[PDB]
Design a protein around this ligand. Structure first.
Ligand code: 6NR
Length: 323
């Protein structure tokens, strides 16, 4: 054998689900993924929504839903052979669809999520996921163009890179991750993302997910030539952050770093004793908290935007030529 099938709206291979349908965690299962998938394709195609205008325990009841969607997809496909313009194919997903796609990719890839908590505590290996909503905020505030290169340093299972790649026109997106468990899941995330995006008929920008160490010699130059870095450095600690500062000091004017802990103080005043500090070459601002997003600390969740700006330093030196 028994199985359920959803035809792609753009004629990719159908999505196949075994029966009984699996459960992913306390709040996500495959039956709900199916209903939401039908729902989202309905948002991509008005005619399908019109054609679609009820029990997850029952095989028959779910086959009935799948067949009703599949028959409607067949009629849409015939509409497209007639006068009707077929859905535009080269487009990015809406934010809503993207959220659903990443959820689905994660659930099909991260087969045993508890294995992601088998890091050494109190180490730079601590794993935590940045939320979809934070990443969406960064995407909206940090305008990227096709001149930009994007890197997630310590990319985990890769979902920050996938979201940015789906949403922006950067020339390339990278993630680099050192630990074996998340880098292995990242390989599946990559394959599942490419598959599901083709299924929905949606475009992404170029991206690569790599197993590596972002403190390596190779990565010094890569960081220097990156225009937008995302780095969830909340548990990296002061030694690792110091090393990252050494690498950021070679970035180009206007390069930007978005992070969970600031690399320089927000109140940095250049003076005689701090000439060497990375605060001499960057503006730092705290991004606006998203409404009602509390951290474990109780206070709202804090991300920081750093912009490389050596005029700070140039002006310090021009000032020393004056009383
Ligand atoms: N020091 C150090 C290192 C620590 N990481 C990784 O950074 C991650 C921080 S969790 C953030 C995950 C995702 N970007 C998100 O925000 O949702 C962990 O997976 C850890 O293994 C590294 N990876 C590559 N090279 C390194 N040198 C390190």
């Amino acid at each position: 054998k028994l199985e359920l099938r959803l035809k792609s709206p753009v004629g990719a291979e159908p999505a196949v689900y075994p029966w009984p349908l699996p459960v992913y965690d306390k709040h996500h299962d495959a039956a709900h993924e199916i209903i939401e998938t039908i729902r989202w394709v309905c948002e991509e195609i008005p005619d399908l929504k019109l054609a679609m205008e009820y029990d997850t325990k029952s095989f028959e009841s779910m086959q009935r839903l799948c067949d009703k969607y599949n028959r409607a997809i067949d009629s849409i496909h015939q509409l497209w052979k007639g006068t009707t313009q077929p859905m535009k194919l080269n487009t990015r997903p809406s934010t809503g669809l993207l959220r659903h796609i990443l959820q689905q990719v994660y659930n099909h890839s991260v087969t045993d999520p508890e294995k992601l908590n088998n890091y050494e505590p109190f180490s730079p290996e601590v794993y935590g996921e940045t939320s979809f909503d934070l990443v969406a905020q960064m995407i909206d505030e940090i305008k990227m163009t096709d001149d930009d290169l994007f890197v997630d340093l310590g990319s985990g299972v890769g979902q920050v890179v996938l979201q940015v790649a789906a949403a922006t026109n950067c020339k390339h997106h990278y993630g680099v991750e050192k630990a074996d468990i998340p880098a292995k899941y990242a390989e599946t995330m990559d394959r599942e993302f490419r598959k599901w995006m083709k299924w929905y008929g949606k475009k992404h920008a170029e991206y690569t997910l790599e197993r590596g160490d972002f403190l390596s010699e190779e990565w010094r130059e890569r960081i220097a030539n990156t225009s937008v870095i995302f780095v969830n450095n909340f548990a990296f600690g002061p030694e690792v952050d110091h090393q990252l500062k050494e690498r950021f000091a070679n970035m180009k004017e206007g390069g930007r770093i978005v992070s969970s802990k600031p690399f320089a103080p927000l109140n940095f005043r250049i003076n005689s004793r701090n000439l060497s500090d990375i605060g001499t070459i960057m503006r730092v601002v705290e991004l606006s908290p998203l409404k009602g997003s509390v951290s474990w600390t109780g206070k709202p969740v804090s991300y920081y935007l750093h912009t490389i700006d050596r005029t700070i330093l140039e002006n310090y030196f021009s000032s020393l030529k004056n009383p």
